[PDB]
Design an enzyme around this catalytic site. Structure first.
Site, PDB file in Angstrom:
ATOM      1  N   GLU A 152       0.803  -1.212   0.000  1.00 41.92           N
ATOM      2  CA  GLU A 152       0.000   0.000   0.000  1.00 41.92           C
ATOM      3  C   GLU A 152       0.839   1.267   0.000  1.00 41.92           C
ATOM      4  OE1 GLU A 152      -2.239  -1.347   3.339  1.00 41.92           O
ATOM      5  OE2 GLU A 152      -4.054  -1.654   2.137  1.00 41.92           O
ATOM      6  N   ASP A 195     -11.893  -6.159  -2.958  1.00 39.35           N
ATOM      7  CA  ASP A 195     -12.674  -7.379  -2.905  1.00 39.35           C
ATOM      8  C   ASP A 195     -14.051  -7.101  -2.285  1.00 39.35           C
ATOM      9  OD1 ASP A 195     -12.524  -8.221   0.169  1.00 39.35           O
ATOM     10  OD2 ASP A 195     -10.633  -7.431  -0.372  1.00 39.35           O
TER      11      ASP A 195
HETATM   12  N1  LIG Z   1     -12.283  -8.526   3.122  1.00 39.23           N
HETATM   13  C1  LIG Z   1     -11.373  -7.776   3.956  1.00 39.23           C
HETATM   14  N2  LIG Z   1     -11.428  -7.909   5.269  1.00 39.23           N
HETATM   15  C2  LIG Z   1     -10.591  -7.192   6.063  1.00 39.23           C
HETATM   16  N3  LIG Z   1      -9.675  -6.351   5.609  1.00 39.23           N
HETATM   17  C3  LIG Z   1      -9.559  -6.162   4.262  1.00 39.23           C
HETATM   18  C4  LIG Z   1      -8.696  -5.381   3.462  1.00 39.23           C
HETATM   19  C5  LIG Z   1      -7.590  -4.388   3.922  1.00 39.23           C
HETATM   20  N4  LIG Z   1      -6.502  -4.814   4.345  1.00 39.23           N
HETATM   21  C6  LIG Z   1      -5.813  -5.599   3.575  1.00 39.23           C
HETATM   22  C7  LIG Z   1      -4.955  -6.612   4.602  1.00 39.23           C
HETATM   23  C8  LIG Z   1      -5.789  -8.031   4.452  1.00 39.23           C
HETATM   24  S1  LIG Z   1      -5.042  -9.320   5.502  1.00 39.23           S
HETATM   25  C9  LIG Z   1      -3.775 -10.220   4.518  1.00 39.23           C
HETATM   26  C10 LIG Z   1      -2.992 -11.186   5.156  1.00 39.23           C
HETATM   27  C11 LIG Z   1      -2.016 -11.885   4.445  1.00 39.23           C
HETATM   28  C12 LIG Z   1      -1.829 -11.637   3.100  1.00 39.23           C
HETATM   29 CL1  LIG Z   1      -0.597 -12.535   2.214  1.00 39.23          CL
HETATM   30  C13 LIG Z   1      -2.635 -10.646   2.434  1.00 39.23           C
HETATM   31  C14 LIG Z   1      -3.579  -9.960   3.127  1.00 39.23           C
HETATM   32  C15 LIG Z   1      -5.092  -6.138   5.757  1.00 39.23           C
HETATM   33  O1  LIG Z   1      -4.094  -5.051   6.006  1.00 39.23           O
HETATM   34  C16 LIG Z   1      -6.557  -5.464   5.708  1.00 39.23           C
HETATM   35  C17 LIG Z   1      -9.100  -5.652   2.140  1.00 39.23           C
HETATM   36  N5  LIG Z   1     -10.098  -6.536   2.138  1.00 39.23           N
HETATM   37  C18 LIG Z   1     -10.410  -6.879   3.423  1.00 39.23           C
END
Ligand SMILES: Nc1ncnc2c(CN3C[C@H](CSc4ccc(Cl)cc4)[C@@H](O)C3)c[nH]c12
Ligand SMILES: Nc1ncnc2c(CN3C[C@H](CSc4ccc(Cl)cc4)[C@@H](O)C3)c[nH]c12
Ligand SMILES: [Mg+2]
Ligand SMILES: [Mg+2]
EC number: 3.2.2.30
Lengths: 230, 230
Positions: A13, A198
């Site tokens: 980000e 998403d």
């Molecule tokens: N459906 C959702 N739910 C919660 N947070 C988010 C987010 C925002 N952020 C992105 C990120 C998702 S957690 C994650 C863990 C491991 C890996 Cl390799 C890729 C992503 C977090 O900083 C929350 C986007 N969609 C989301």
């Protein structure tokens, strides 16, 4: 100008933030974070990614304020959509944020509420209005709504339905409420900007992987357009 | 001596600390917290309650370190028991702590794990060993085990069973992991001490109300006995 802190949660980000601003940055380590300190348009900018979740983002925001003396905090990143009119890549600013996973119901408190606090945390009306003016002038939709933050990645219809019914949330992420909360406690203006990656449903993991890079860039480019007006 | 930060989550957890230390305190507001600054046995002590939960406690611990320069952090308060041998009023020190409500399973991560972090956060072996030596000399049981922290008050057999099965936790609370995490990020020794107030089950709310005052005092008195050895 005023010193500006710029935060994301993941390195992905802030990579577009560092690239789009394009200035020289000095890397300063503190508290497990790397802060990138630069000068842009006569303003000092401090950029960092906090790492994922509420504890990480609370720590990094507190460090930004106490150790670097930032006078405003702009958060940029991605989020899951909870409403049909927020499509992939669409932008929103959080008018209010809630910690959706706080549960003191055993003591008859409303969900999201903690004693000596509040369910909803406010952000800067001035920064949100600036965002809306820029979006209108650039012919892009910008929603203003509630963002729900918690320490779980949301990927189910059931949890989406709870967030909408309990909090009327428009998007979900894992850091905004904690960032906005710290800023409120220190009297620092805050804006939380997110681009949809998403739909927070069963397929959210695959959508997130596909759209993280583009959505992170969309939010970062918009954040830069705000800094250009500050 | 070394400057010592002393934290609880609720005002009720620090009231016995302020009374038992018995010295004059100066009240210093910062970031929505009140810090009580005193001198005890040639050591500066900074006492505060964070307010409940992970965000509050992360903020207050970061302020303690960055704004007050504390060289160690001792947390004192109450907790719910997850194991039969921890009865009401019994003490434990956390050897490791976990954020039990962190869920990135959508990306195939273990529960409790966040990228660029770890499931279990360590505390000071030296402070924990001091606690155990004091407990032995004072003929009191002191368990050393895992504490699980999350933003929910736990009051169900089902959630207790999860905490035991997933993390082998001995007690549950809402602040220890965040405090220990911040201390680790800044290289500050930390000890998390808790006295049992309830059994984290269906009747935990009533038990907590009955035993908060006594259990908070038991933890505070023990914390003072540790400071007397520092
Ligand atoms: N459906 C959702 N739910 C919660 N947070 C988010 C987010 C925002 N952020 C992105 C990120 C998702 S957690 C994650 C863990 C491991 C890996 Cl390799 C890729 C992503 C977090 O900083 C929350 C986007 N969609 C989301
Ligand atoms: N079963 C349990 N689950 C989680 N945390 C705790 C704790 C430890 N802390 C006490 C306190 C419980 S939440 C609460 C809310 C409103 C009111 Cl008026 C009284 C208590 C939090 O700081 C966690 C003891 N038992 C616990
Ligand atoms: Mg304010
Ligand atoms: Mg360490």
């Amino acid at each position: 100008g005023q010193k500006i802190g710029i935060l994301g949660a993941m390195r992905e980000e802030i990579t577009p933030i560092l690239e789009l601003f394009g200035v020289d940055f000095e890397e300063i380590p503190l508290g497990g974070n790397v802060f990138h300190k630069g000068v842009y348009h006569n303003k000092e900018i401090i950029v960092a990614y906090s790492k994922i979740g509420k504890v990480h983002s609370t720590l990094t925001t507190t460090s930004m304020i106490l150790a670097f003396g930032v006078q405003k905090v702009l958060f940029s990143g991605v989020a899951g959509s909870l409403v049909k009119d927020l499509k992939i890549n669409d932008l929103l600013v959080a008018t209010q944020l809630v910690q959706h996973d706080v549960d003191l119901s055993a003591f008859d408190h409303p969900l999201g509420f903690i004693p000596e606090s509040a369910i909803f945390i406010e952000t800067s009306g001035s920064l949100n209005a600036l965002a809306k003016k820029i979006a209108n002038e650039q012919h892009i939709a910008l929603k203003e709504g509630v963002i729900a933050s918690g320490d779980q990645f949301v990927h189910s219809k059931e949890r989406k339905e709870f967030l909408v019914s309990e909090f009327k949330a428009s998007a979900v992420e894992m850091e905004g409420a904690s960032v906005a909360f710290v800023c409120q406690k220190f009297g620092v203006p805050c804006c939380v900007l997110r681009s949809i990656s998403d739909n927070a449903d069963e397929k959210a993991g695959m959508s997130f992987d596909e759209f993280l890079e583009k959505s992170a860039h969309t939010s970062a480019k918009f954040l830069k357009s705000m800094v250009d007006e500050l």
